[PDB]
């Protein structure tokens, strides 16, 4: 057997252009005119981008351009937007009723502005406090590039224990979102002055400090 | 769009069978056979394991079976093996131009007890409001297996605009942690009565509500 070749990664500058090559075999690609292209957004419910060599499905992003250059197929993305970061796959009909896929090309847009995160800290709410627990939530958001680190400050001494953070995910953007959580007993929470969520990103640091005077 | 409602997580053990399901909203159903199922491992290209409701392609192990009745196609891994563990998707060809995808699933071969998520909705802290910002967080924590559906609601009606959902992170107890957020204005927040964060894990829904109670 075999599964179509794709170049594992395809960069381009902003507003520019890239072309990915789904490359097959006489028995599949070049056998028939039935190559579709797929946009699989950083691990997501994938969509169809082309169906037959160069036909843009009923509501596609402006200028996905499909090519079949013998047994090499090509998808040309131009007017480069940030949102084109994805997993690009192709599929060609091979024989008896069935389709063959390709390796999988990750598309990379360059020239994306670096953004420093919006740290929103949270005090626990009444309900949680009634239910008898306290969990604090640092929300880091709209950052680029997606490397951030979260310290917790118990009260100006650190609190390594009871913290839990998340790997940054891409938004309907190409900005990331992350969060830390500190799980506390309410007791512990009446019992002392400040809590702090310190977030470092590309040199910057943003600290947010919360105090027990939450209203409800 | 994802008008093919697919479960968030589907899990079993070796030798236990698992149904994935794929529901259509589609004013379509009946006038239909063309429902194709895809087996997709993390790292690999997507590969079809079912075409036209019940036909697997060449080399699909016997255990995969598809069905469709009502508006529901179903895929039964009949006797679960290790690398049945993958992302699964479904499909429907509204002829040519309109290739509707389902939203995905996951096959978890459990080797950890099932953990239904802790939801913990936090409302626009008084400070953030004092900055004329509005954001409520839906912490989803301690869930296994690490796939979960998240949806929001204002005054009953669902909210789509402004919600960003992170990807399940593995925690220092091999259970999972996600977060959504709804970004708003004090206006929109204050101008309502109740906001649910609604979360779906396997065969479970947790809906937690926050009301605007406006201390400053």
């Amino acid at each position: 057997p075999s599964a179509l070749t794709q170049p594992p990664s395809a960069s381009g500058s902003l507003g520019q252009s890239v072309t990915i090559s789904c490359t097959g075999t006489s028995s599949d690609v070049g056998g028939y005119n039935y190559v579709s292209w797929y946009q699989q957004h950083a691990g997501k419910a994938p969509k169809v981008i082309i169906y037959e060599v160069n036909k843009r499905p009923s509501g596609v992003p402006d200028r996905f351009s499909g090519s079949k250059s013998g047994n090499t197929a090509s998808l040309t993305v131009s007017g480069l937007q940030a949102e084109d970061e994805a997993d690009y796959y192709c599929s060609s009909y091979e024989g008896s009723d069935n389709f063959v896929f390709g390796t999988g090309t990750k598309v990379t847009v360059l020239g994306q502005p670096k953004a420093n995160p919006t740290v929103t800290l949270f005090p626990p709410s009444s309900e949680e406090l009634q239910a008898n627990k306290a969990t604090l939530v640092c929300l880091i958001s709209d950052f680029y590039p997606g490397a951030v680190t979260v310290a917790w400050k118990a009260d100006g001494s650190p609190v390594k224990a009871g913290v839990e953070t998340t790997k940054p995910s891409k938004q309907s953007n190409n900005k990331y979102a992350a969060s830390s959580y500190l799980s506390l007993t309410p007791e512990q929470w009446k019992s002392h002055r400040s809590y702090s969520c310190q977030v470092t990103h590309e040199g910057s640091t943003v600290e947010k400090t919360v105090a027990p005077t939450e209203c409800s | 769009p994802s008008a093919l409602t697919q479960p968030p997580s589907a899990s079993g053990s070796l030798g236990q069978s698992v149904t994935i399901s794929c529901t259509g909203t589609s004013s379509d159903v009946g006038g239909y056979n063309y429902v194709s199922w895809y087996q997709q491992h993390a790292g690999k290209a997507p590969k079809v394991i079912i075409y036209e409701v019940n036909k697997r392609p060449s080399g699909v192990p016997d255990r995969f079976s598809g069905s469709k009745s009502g508006n529901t196609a179903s895929l039964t891994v009949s006797g679960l093996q290790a690398e049945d563990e993958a992302d699964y998707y479904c499909s429907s060809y509204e002829g040519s131009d309109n290739f509707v995808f389902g939203t995905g699933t996951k096959v978890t071969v459990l080797g950890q007890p099932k953990a239904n998520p802790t939801v913990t909705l936090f409302p626009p802290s008084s400070e953030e409001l004092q900055a004329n910002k509005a954001t409520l967080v839906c912490l989803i924590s301690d869930f296994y297996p690490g796939a979960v559906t998240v949806a929001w609601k204002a005054d009953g009606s669902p909210v789509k605009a402004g919600v960003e959902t992170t990807k399940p992170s593995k925690q220092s107890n091999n259970k999972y942690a996600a977060s959504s957020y709804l970004s708003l204005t004090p206006e929109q927040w204050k101008s309502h009565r109740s906001y649910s964060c609604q979360v779906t894990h396997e065969g479970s829904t947790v809906e937690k509500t926050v009301a605007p109670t406006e201390c400053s």
Partner: peptide
């Protein structure tokens, strides 16, 4: 993959 629909086609067919």
């Amino acid at each position: 993959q629909x086609h067919x």
